[model samples]
Target: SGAIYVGNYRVVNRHLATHNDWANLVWEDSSRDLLVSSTTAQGCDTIARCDCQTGVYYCSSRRKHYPVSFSKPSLIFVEASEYYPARYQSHLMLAVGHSEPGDCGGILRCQHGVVGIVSTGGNGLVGFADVRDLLWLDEE
Candidate 1:
């Protein structure tokens, strides 16, 4: 067996960690291996299938793929089940910060005025994010 199979594509409720200034919406997913929350064609609002080992977000509307952030605003990935169900846990999350597009080599701003890229990211941005693949780390 691979990943414990959960349900199929279905609607899932989501939440925020606070601080809203017309933040609009950067993500939404009941969850994905590739989970899409605001999935218009699913909007990122779906988790259908990926490598079969697991599923991740992929927009049917935009045909864009997304990493299932699980919308977990927790202190850890394996422990986010307290808020989300165990069937909705993963080994990854987006490391958040005050950075914007084009740093050429930006890392997680683990703290205020600190782009200290270390090993853990449970303290960074606990939201979903689209990124370029290379070196990825958690903000714990």
Candidate 2:
């Protein structure tokens, strides 16, 4: 489901990311929050893990099925001048593409390790929310 329902309120503020052209979404709830475990809180390190090929992760969403690739590290805002930090802050680039609009809020998992959340995509490129700040939201 794109959103969780609670009476008349929608739990996800999806437009927060879409308006910025990122495929990510924010969770907004009146009386609910997720429990962030140690594994989930720490998340996955793309720099250390992206070059590996022994294990694999998949992009999870209701819109489509795509596999996460570990070809190389993603380009950060400083490295990729085209990716504006004003709009793309705290987003992690994905090695896969072919994303769609409703694909936001999807999970990218490497086994039990929490990788990232699908945030934005365009022009044959994909991006996910960096779990660092996101886990802070889950706790704080």
Candidate 3:
């Protein structure tokens, strides 16, 4: 399948999981893959075949510790479906709510930085995978 539109960015299926079991994190911590994008492109205008740059943010792995000093106000970008015809449920995590199933691959941002990607959500709660470990997978 091709990329799917989740919020403003196109989330391609390409992913990376270098440490422990990635599947386990999906259920417990509600983390998803590192959705990669072009680091050069500044913007994308095309809808079907688009290329863009992700917001530059510090990775926890590079810092060697969690961002304890960063602020907590965060944002998650996911596709909002209106015609699912069923209650909301997170496929990656054991969560339920009135949200759309499109909550799967959302980009999470916080105070001019990226926190993670949406892995699960509902009931006024969301599950996001930190971008730290995934940054370890990045090359060049």
Assess candidate 2 and give its TM-score to the true structure.
Answer: 0.43
Candidate 2 Cα outliers beyond 4 Å, as residue runs: 1-63, 70-88, 132-140
Angstrom error at residue 7, model 3: 19
Candidate number with greatest TM-score: 2
Q: Report, for every candidate in turn, its global Cα lDDT versus the true structure.
A: 0.25, 0.39, 0.33
Whose lDDT is greatest here? 2
lDDT of 3 by residue, 10-63 (tens): 333233322332322322222233344432233332221111122222222232
Q: Give the TM-score of each candidate.
A: 0.21, 0.43, 0.33
Q: Write the per-residue lDDT of candidate 1 for residues 1-140, one digit (tens) a residue.
A: 00111122212123222233113233334333222122122222112222121123322323343333232222334334433554433333443422221121222222121121111223323232222121121110
Predict model 2's lDDT versus the native: 0.39
* Model 1 TM: 0.21
Model 1 clashes, total count: 32
Q: Put down candidate 2 lDDT per residue, 72-136, tens digits, no spaces.
A: 23434422223223332333545556566456555554543445545556566666543423433
lDDT of 3: 0.33
